[PDB]
Scaffold this active site. Structure first.
Site, short mmCIF file in Angstrom:
data_model
loop_
_atom_site.label_atom_id
_atom_site.label_comp_id
_atom_site.label_asym_id
_atom_site.label_seq_id
_atom_site.Cartn_x
_atom_site.Cartn_y
_atom_site.Cartn_z
N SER A 288 -0.72 15.53 -12.08
CA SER A 288 -0.98 15.17 -13.46
C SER A 288 -1.22 16.42 -14.28
O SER A 288 -1.76 17.41 -13.79
CB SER A 288 -2.19 14.23 -13.53
OG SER A 288 -2.58 13.97 -14.87
N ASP B 274 0.83 -1.20 0.00
CA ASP B 274 0.00 0.00 0.00
C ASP B 274 0.87 1.26 0.00
O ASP B 274 1.38 1.68 1.05
CB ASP B 274 -0.89 -0.01 1.25
CG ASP B 274 -1.78 1.21 1.35
OD1 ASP B 274 -1.91 1.93 0.34
OD2 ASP B 274 -2.39 1.41 2.43
#
Length: 330
Positions: free
Chosen positions: A199, A35
């Site tokens: 992004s 994770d």
């Protein structure tokens, strides 16, 4: 040194991925959920409340000759999905794919929430975010990666998650045969303890690319792709009959649909998520309403590039002095 381990979807939907991890001496192999959005290595154990164990493999520290109780240490964690766990702490030897760390903090669960109990395939979590998020008190502990880093050939790990198929976690090297083209690297902020990056935009299907900054985290422990409501609405508007359902808890769509792809930007590069990666199947057994793999982050407080996005790429988690993230198509 290096390590290389195969990671396997837990079910037919890729709801999560498990990776075998050797703990203790002799080894006890547990299948852990790696994770990159948390920083605790915790396991089901011989100390876990019996009624809260249902099929998991447990770590028994008393059977490990290298286990040592970390005196006075406790841990307690709550995850973004509302699940939680807590307990005490041992140090022991932990190996992943041939890479060994001695003295790793292994957090033994005394209590786990129902969602963990109900998932027989996940024996615990191995956190790969920054150690500043580790919950051990009163002395915070380091992640497996943080402990291994100095010994690694290069201070990196890579995630290569499969779509409906196994994939690979590598430590200490970049497998140049595992991706196409080049790896595009992008800046990381560690301010919130995550692999947080920006992004450069998105496209829906064959549509034009929208240049827009989207701050979010690369999180292997989250199943879906959570993005701003504007982006998510633009995606689902291209699927006939799709709608946001408050009763179900997100966007659903007719299972008869053909889903468009979703592209996200990494600098000037583009990662394309095929439409089929966005299908999470019937909302309940036998339903013709299917759950979407792209959902709104509104009210999460952060955008999350979870498995839906990451499995479309070869992802480099570069833990150099100034960390960065790399993405390649594959």
């Amino acid at each position: 040194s290096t390590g290389s381990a195969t990671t396997t979807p837990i079910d037919s939907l890729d709801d999560a991925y498990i990776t075998p991890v050797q703990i203790g001496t002799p080894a006890q192999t547990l299948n852990l959920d790696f994770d990159t959005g948390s920083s605790d290595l915790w396991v089901f154990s011989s100390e876990t409340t019996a009624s809260e164990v249902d099929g998991q493999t447990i770590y028994t520290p008393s059977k490990s000759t290298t286990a040592k109780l970390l005196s006075g240490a406790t841990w307690s964690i709550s995850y973004g999905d509302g699940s939680s766990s807590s307990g005490d702490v041992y140090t022991d030897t932990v190996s992943v794919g041939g890479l060994t760390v001695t003295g790793q903090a292994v957090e033994s669960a005394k209590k786990v929430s129902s969602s963990f109990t109900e998932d027989s395939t996940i024996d615990g979590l191995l956190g790969l975010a920054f150690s500043t998020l580790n919950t051990v008190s009163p002395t915070q502990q380091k992640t497996f990666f943080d402990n291994a880093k100095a010994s690694l050939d290069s201070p990196v790990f890579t995630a290569d998650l499969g779509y409906h198929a196994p994939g690979t976690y590598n430590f200490g090297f970049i497998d140049t045969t595992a991706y196409t083209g080049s790896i595009t690297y992008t800046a990381v902020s560690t301010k919130q303890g995550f692999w947080e990056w920006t992004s450069t935009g998105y496209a829906v299907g064959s549509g034009t690319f929208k240049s827009t900054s989207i701050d979010g985290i690369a999180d292997t422990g989250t199943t879906l792709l959570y993005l701003p409501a504007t982006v998510v609405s633009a995606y689902w508007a291209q699927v006939s009959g799709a709608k946001s359902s408050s009763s179900v808890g997100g966007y659903v769509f007719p299972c008869s649909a053909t889903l468009p792809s979703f592209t996200f930007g990494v600098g000037s590069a583009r990662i394309v998520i095929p439409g089929d990666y966005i299908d999470f199947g019937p909302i309940s057994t036998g339903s013709s309403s299917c759950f979407g793999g792209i959902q709104s982050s509104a009210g999460i407080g952060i955008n999350i590039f979870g498995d839906v996005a990451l499995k479309a790429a070869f992802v480099v988690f570069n833990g150099a002095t100034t960390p960065t993230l790399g993405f390649a198509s594959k």
